[PDB]
Amino acid sequence: GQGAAALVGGVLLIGAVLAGNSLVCVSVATERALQTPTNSFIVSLAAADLLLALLVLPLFVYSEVQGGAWLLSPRLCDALMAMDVMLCTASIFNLCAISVDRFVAVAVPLRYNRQGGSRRQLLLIGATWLLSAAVAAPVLCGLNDPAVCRLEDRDYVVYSSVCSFFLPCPLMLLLYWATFRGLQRWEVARRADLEDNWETLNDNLKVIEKADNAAQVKDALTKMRAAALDAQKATPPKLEDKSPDSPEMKDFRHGFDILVGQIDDALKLANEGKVKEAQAAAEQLKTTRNAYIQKYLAKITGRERKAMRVLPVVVGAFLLCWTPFFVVHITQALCPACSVPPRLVSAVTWLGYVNSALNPVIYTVFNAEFRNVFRKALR
Ligand SMILES: CNc1cc(OC)c(C(=O)N[C@@H]2CCN(Cc3ccccc3)[C@@H]2C)cc1Cl
Ligand SMILES: CCCCCCCC/C=C/CCCCCCCC(=O)O
Ligand SMILES: CCCCCCCC/C=C/CCCCCCCC(=O)O
Ligand SMILES: CCCCCCCC/C=C/CCCCCCCC(=O)O
Ligand SMILES: CCCCCCCC/C=C/CCCCCCCC(=O)O
Ligand code: NA
């Protein structure tokens, strides 16, 4: 009765965690549009969820069929609980790492000399996992004084409730808040104008790629030049009060000067009838914007802020799913006499674990790139 619901519910939960989260990892692996700094953390979150389904949920379900009785070794129980605590902590610490990472990307504009990221996200992810293991490590040493698998050490439970949850949460919330406000300060008033300029650039690079002749190339380059110059005049509020002589204003203007200079050289070539050379100059121009310009066009048009919309939904769902769990557990640990109904302890646990099945759904619905890869699984 109570056992059959756990079994069916558990097999369905485990199936849904493995299915959804493997499809996330494979998608980041197969689709170039998904290989971003942010999605490195999303893969880390997927790993945490896959590991939960592999290492924790099966014996959790088995436990639930036995009505919470634990018939196996007490050392195995300790091993399970330490893994339980670590994976929970790792999910939270990774949501925290995202907000730290995104705040820094926003607050600290950097341009590298060489190809690729710094892999600082990977280092931060490594740090996140080692920190989660550090929080969980004492559980492995055996904290209990029976036939059930529970954390009975009240000081440990309060400690981890605070470190793993009640402390990261407000800080994470403050950081997401600062991050979103930071980006907004970069978004120009005349968004649609700058989007037009941006489309002119991309549409005409494609016209150039397939041109029949030099005049088409020259016409396309001429439009690009005008759009580059317009875009150059779209100043973000972030730099509005910055003087014309400011080294941050001198930066801004410069990226567009390099661009206009490249367009001019391609123009000279097209004008002389050198189609292939003009097309190569323009392709070489698809790489100068690939880093210097386009990164911060997505920023100043509001695209970047829009693409971050999936993150609060993920954070939100995590808070909905785990807040009841941590309120129940810290209460019990602080106040033995504050009796929580066992059926509710069971409920908030399942609620916590079902979070692990939710993120793949959240990405599919609320993020455009993920939604896109998904919707072309119609093959
Ligand atoms: C990150 N902080 C914590 C996380 C916990 O579990 C996710 C718990 C917790 O009490 N977990 C219990 C301990 C075992 N776990 C369920 C389970 C897992 C595997 C086999 C049997 C029972 C329960 C949900 C406590 C803390 Cl402080
Ligand atoms: C935005 C702050 C966080 C909000 C709470 C997060 C909970 C996420 C849970 C997932 C279920 C969402 C179901 C909503 C479906 C409608 C979405 C839509 O209309 O585009
Ligand atoms: C418990 C319900 C959900 C609580 C969490 C809500 C979402 C967590 C993130 C909050 C940081 C605020 C970021 C702004 C979100 C909207 C984006 C925007 O309007 O620019
Ligand atoms: C992210 C959402 C944050 C929500 C914070 C509120 C949750 C914390 C409340 C739980 C404390 C329960 C108090 C238990 C009584 C302790 C009294 C005693 O120690 O004797
Ligand atoms: C490639 C996308 C991410 C990896 C796959 C995720 C696996 C779980 C997705 C299935 C959820 C289906 C329910 C809602 C479908 C939303 C599709 C849509 O909005 O058009
Ligand atoms: Na998780």
By most ligand atoms within 8 Å of CB, the mutation choice from 355, 365, 371 for ligand 2 is: 365
Closest by Cα among 337, 320, 357 to 48: 357
Among 257, 278, 301, give the residue marking a domain's end.
301
Q: Residue holding tokens 């949920």?
A: 57
Domain match, 31 and 48 both: yes
Q: How far apart are CA 103 and CA 152, in angstroms?
A: 38
Q: How many angstroms is it from 192 CA to the middle of ligand 2?
A: 28
Whether residue 91 contacts residue 43, with contact meaning beta carbons closer than 8 Å, is answered with no
| Residue 93 sits in the same domain as residue 66 | yes
The residue to mutate among 364, 376, 378, having the most atoms of ligand 5 within 8 angstroms of its beta carbon, is: 364
Nearest by Cα to 229 from 200, 189, 192: 200
Angular region, 243: left φ>0, alpha ψ -120 to 50, beta rest: beta
Query: What would the two tokens of residue 361 be?
Result: 């759904």
Same domain, 34 and 171: yes
Residues in the chain preceding a C-to-N separation beyond 2.5 angstroms (breaks): 145
Token representation of residue 376: 């072309």
Number of domains present in the structure of the chain: 2
**13 strand-pairing partners:** none
Q: Are residues 179 and 95 both part of a single domain?
A: yes
Cα–Cα nearest to 347, from 321, 310, 377: 321
Residue-range definition of the domain harbouring residue 155: 2-186+304-375
What's the CA-to-centroid distance between 370 and ligand 5, angstroms? 8
240-261: burial string, b at 16+ Cβ within 10 Å, e else: eebeeeeeeeeebeebbeebbe
Contact predicate 27/372, CB 8 Å: no
104 and 251 assigned to the same domain = no
Atom 8 of ligand 1, nearest CA residue: 85
Return the HEC string of the chain. Answer: CHHHHHHHHHHHHHHHHHHHHHHHHHHHHHCHHHCCHHHHHHHHHHHHHHHHHHHCHHHHHHHHHCCCECCCCHHHHHHHHHHHHHHHHHHHHHHHHHHHHHHHHHHCCCCCCCCCCCCHHHHHHHHHHHHHHHHHHHHHHCCCCCCECCCCCHHHHHHHHHHHHHCHHHHHHHHHHHHHHHHHCCCCCCHHHHHHHHHHHHHHHHHHHCCCCHHHHHHHHHHHHHHHHHHHCCCCHHHCCCCCCCHHHHHHHHHHHHHHHHHHHHHHHHHCCCHHHHHHHHHCHHHHHHHHHHHHHHHHCCHHHHHCCHHHHHHHHHHHHHHHHHHHHHHHHHCCCCCCCHHHHHHHHHHHHHHHHHHHHHHHHHCHHHHHHHHCCCC
- Residue 125 shares a structural domain with residue 75: yes
Q: Is the distance from the beta carbon of residue 320 to the nearest atom of ligand 2 less than 6 Å?
A: yes
From the CA of 176, give the closest atom in ligand 3. 11
Kindly state whether residues 228 and 296 are assigned to the same domain: yes
Q: Are residues 116 and 151 located together in one domain of the fold?
A: yes
Phi-psi region for residue 273, left (φ > 0), alpha (ψ -120 to 50) or beta?
A: left
Cα separation, 127 vs 362, in Å, equals 26
Beta-ladder partners of 99: none
Resolution (A): 2.1
Which residue's alpha carbon is at the smallest distance from atom 15 of ligand 2? 365
| Final residue before a domain boundary, out of 241, 275, 301 | 301
Establish whether residue 27 lines the binding site of ligand 5, counting it when its CB lies within 6 angstroms of any ligand atom: yes
Please tell me the distance between residue 174's alpha carbon and the centre of ligand 3 in angstroms.
10
CA-closest candidate to residue 262, choices 249, 276, 278, 274: 278
Instruction: Identify residue 89 by its one-letter amino acid code.
Output: T
Technique that determined the structure: X-ray
Determine the distance separating the centroid of ligand 1 and the alpha carbon of 325, expressed in angstroms: 9
Residues β-bridged to residue 74: none
Q: Is the CB of 323 under 6 A from ligand 2?
A: no
User: For position 206, which CATH number holds?
Assistant: 1.20.120.10
CATH of the domain at 134: 1.20.1070.10
> Quick one: which ligand is closest to 315's CA?
3
Which atom of ligand 3 is closest in space to residue 320's alpha carbon?
1
Report the first-to-last Cα separation within the chain, whole angstroms.
Answer: 41
Position 196: which residue type? D
Q: How many whole angstroms from 331 Cα to the centroid of ligand 4? A: 6
Are residues 161 and 294 both part of a single domain?
no
Same domain, 250 and 354: no
Distance in angstroms (rounded) separating the CA atoms of residues 93 and 21: 18
The domain boundary, picked from 258, 276, 301, lies at: 301
Tokens of 55: 């290492």
Q: How far is the CA of 354 from the centre of ligand 4 (A)?
A: 23
- C-beta of 174 in contact with ligand 3 (< 6 A): no
Q: Which residue from 291, 266, 130, 106 is spatially nearest to 184, judged by alpha carbons?
A: 106
Q: Are residues 109 and 250 in the same domain?
A: no
Q: Which one-letter amino acid corresponds to residue 325?
A: F
Which amino acid is located at 357 in the chain? Answer: A
Q: Same structural domain for residues 30 and 177?
A: yes
Contact (CB, 8 A) for 311 and 135 = no
